[PDB]
Amino acid sequence: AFAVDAAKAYKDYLASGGQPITNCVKMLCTHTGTGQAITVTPEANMDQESFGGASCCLYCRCHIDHPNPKGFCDLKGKYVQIPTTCANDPVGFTLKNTVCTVCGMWKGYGCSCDQ
Amino acid sequence: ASSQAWQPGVAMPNLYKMQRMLLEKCDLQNYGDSATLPKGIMMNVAKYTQLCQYLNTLTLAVPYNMRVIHFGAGSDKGVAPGTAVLRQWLPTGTLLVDSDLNDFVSDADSTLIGDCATVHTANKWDLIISDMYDPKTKNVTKENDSKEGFFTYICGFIQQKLALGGSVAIKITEHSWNADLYKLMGHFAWWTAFVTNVNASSSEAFLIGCNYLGKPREQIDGYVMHANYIFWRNTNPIQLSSYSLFDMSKFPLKLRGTAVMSLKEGQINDMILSLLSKGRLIIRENNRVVISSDVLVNN
Numbered sequence: 410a411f412a413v414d415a416a417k418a419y420k421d422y423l424a425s426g427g428q429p430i431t432n433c434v435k436m437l438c439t440h441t442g443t444g445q446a447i448t449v450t451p452e453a454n455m456d457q458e459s460f461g462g463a464s465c466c467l468y469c470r471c472h473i474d475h476p477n478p479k480g481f482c483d484l485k486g487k488y489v490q491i492p493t494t495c496a497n498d499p500v501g502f503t504l505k506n507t508v509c510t511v512c513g514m515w516k517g518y519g520c521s522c523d524q
Numbered sequence: 525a526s527s528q529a530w531q532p533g534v535a536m537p538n539l540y541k542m543q544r545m546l547l548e549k550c551d552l553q554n555y556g557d558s559a560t561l562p563k564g565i566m567m568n569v570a571k572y573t574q575l576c577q578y579l580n581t582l583t584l585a586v587p588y589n590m591r592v593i594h595f596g597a598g599s600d601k602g603v604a605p606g607t608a609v610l611r612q613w614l615p616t617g618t619l620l621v622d623s624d625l626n627d628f629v630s631d632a633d634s635t636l637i638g639d640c641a642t643v644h645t646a647n648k649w650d651l652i653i654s655d656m657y658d659p660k661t662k663n664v665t666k667e668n669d670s671k672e673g674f675f676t677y678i679c680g681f682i683q684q685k686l687a688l689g690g691s692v693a694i695k696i697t698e699h700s701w702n703a704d705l706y707k708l709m710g711h712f713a714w715w716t717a718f719v720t721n722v723n724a725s726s727s728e729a730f731l732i733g734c735n736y737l738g739k740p741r742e743q744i745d746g747y748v749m750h751a752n753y754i755f756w757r758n759t760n761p762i763q764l765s766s767y768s769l770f771d772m773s774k775f776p777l778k779l780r781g782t783a784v785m786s787l788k789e790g791q792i793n794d795m796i797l798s799l800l801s802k803g804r805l806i807i808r809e810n811n812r813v814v815i816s817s818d819v820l821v822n823n
């Protein structure tokens with residue numbers, strides 16, 4: 410079945426010098442939160458910016474199907490914390506990175522379940 | 525910089541509400557000026573944050589499994605910034621439904637697309653927010669009259685689907701306004717027109733009805749009260765300010781755990797109205813929430 414892999418078509422569009430998806434909704438917060446990747450409320454720390462999930466979800470933003478049993482979206486209705494340094498492209502960041510199931514931090518940005 | 529530069533916005537003073545002015549053009553001293561926003565923050569995020577900051581100071585009824593509906597939640601950008609803020613502001617477990625004429629992605633539980641006139645619902649709501657504005661209002665080709673359109677739907681929805689003790693915040697402008705809506709503010713324990721400090725250079729204000737009583741407590745002429753509002757806005761220049769946005773430590777709405785009861789038009793006495801008037805009680809069915817969007821079928 411011709412499965413439309415937009416997740417990669419975006420990675421291939423950025424690497425070709427393409428403008429990242431804009432109008433992601435950044436939230437006002439104290440910047441004194443857990444620092445966890447996905448949260449029911451903004452949990453950005455001094456090194457992160459919080460955004461509304463729906464606005465950072467490629468599937469949501471392109472009006473396409475969510476690769477998930479029953480098409481459930483795990484960003485819509487939540488807040489995603491993005492390292493201040495990679496905040497220029499929050500959609501790109503949520504695809505290229507992975508969440509730690511043990512501590513809930515981003516693996517490579519806060520998850521210290523190895524050191 | 526007045527002591528009101530440190531507030532989320534400015535509420536129309538009581539003395540301006542008691543006047544009987546004639547409608548005049550709105551000529552704001554700083555019209556067209558933009559406020560300085562925190563880096564990377566969208567105008568509508570700042571605006572909704574100041575509105576919620578102000579709502580935190582009112583006697584809102586906040587029960588468990590609270591029901592909030594948000595009309596005019598879309599934008600040309602295709603996202604719902606105001607819905608993102610309401611989600612941040614409301615207690616966890618709060619049912620949030622939003623709607624707009626045009627398609628948009630939202631952090632709300634349910635999103636209905638289409639004219640508000642096609643939205644139906646079996647249930648009553650605890651809080652109604654409308655940021656609807658018709659872009660055709662920009663064609664001032666005649667007298668500034670009470671507009672209809674979505675304002676007609678809104679007056680019907682408030683009288684039929686707002687739980688007693690419930691509150692509303694409806695966006696209006698110099699030309700985007702309705703007289704029956706002003707008359708309805710008189711059916712609440714208290715009301716005011718609220719201007720956000722970040723958008724103080726606009727005729728925009730949110731009419732805020734606090735604690736719905738289902739019956740008129742105050743006799744209000746919409747034509748007079750809108751003139752009183754323009755008069756206030758013309759004579760009180762408000763300094764643009766985004767200071768309230770820098771302290772987000774007290775932002776989240778407290779879950780007052782307000783009581784929800786299912787009384788009929790019989791048990792409504794003075795001991796009850798007293799509790800409604802202090803956001804100590806919500807009166808409505810506690811059935812599951814069902815909403816529908818009418819679909820006109822053509823060829």
Ligand SMILES: [C]O[C]1[C]([O])[C]([C]OP([O])(=O)OP([O])(=O)OP([O])(=O)O[C][C]2O[C](N3=[C]N([C])C4=C3N=C([N])[N]C4=O)[C]([O])[C]2[O])O[C]1N1[C]=NC2=C1N=[C]N=C2[N]
Binds near residue numbers: 555698726727
């Ligand atoms: C997100 O919410 C949006 C905005 O944040 C919010 C407020 O917007 P606003 O522009 O500030 O509104 P306003 O100009 O203050 O009032 P008005 O009723 O539009 O006046 C109509 C007309 O009267 C004149 N006028 C009005 N005033 C008060 C004047 C002045 N002239 C002056 N010299 N001095 C003034 O004080 C001018 O010519 C105006 O055009 O309304 C929403 N909204 C706006 N536009 C759209 C839209 N939503 C969707 N699509 C849209 N296209």
Ligand SMILES: C[n+]1cn([C@@H]2O[C@H](COP(=O)(O)OP(=O)(O)OP(=O)(O)O)[C@@H](O)[C@H]2O)c2nc(N)[nH]c(=O)c21
Binds near residue numbers: 581582583584734
């Ligand atoms: C903010 N608010 C205003 N009122 C009524 O309007 C009166 C004056 O309105 P006000 O907002 O100017 O209060 P004031 O500045 O006097 O209060 P202070 O901050 O405690 O000094 C209030 O005392 C109430 O009767 C209100 N009445 C109800 N039910 N709920 C509200 O949230 C509310």
Ligand SMILES: Nc1ncnc2c1ncn2[C@@H]1O[C@H](CSCC[C@H](N)C(=O)O)[C@@H](O)[C@H]1O
Binds near residue numbers: 605625657659
């Ligand atoms: N009759 C109607 N029914 C539903 N939505 C309507 C409407 N008339 C106007 N609107 C909507 O009202 C909105 C005003 S601007 C809304 C901005 C939004 N609150 C935000 O957070 O950014 C527009 O999206 C417009 O489509």
Ligand SMILES: [Cl-]
Binds near residue numbers: 528533534535536
């Ligand atoms: Cl004030």
Ligand SMILES: [Zn+2]
Binds near residue numbers: 463467469475485
């Ligand atoms: Zn999604």
Ligand SMILES: [Zn+2]
Binds near residue numbers: 510512514521
């Ligand atoms: Zn970990």
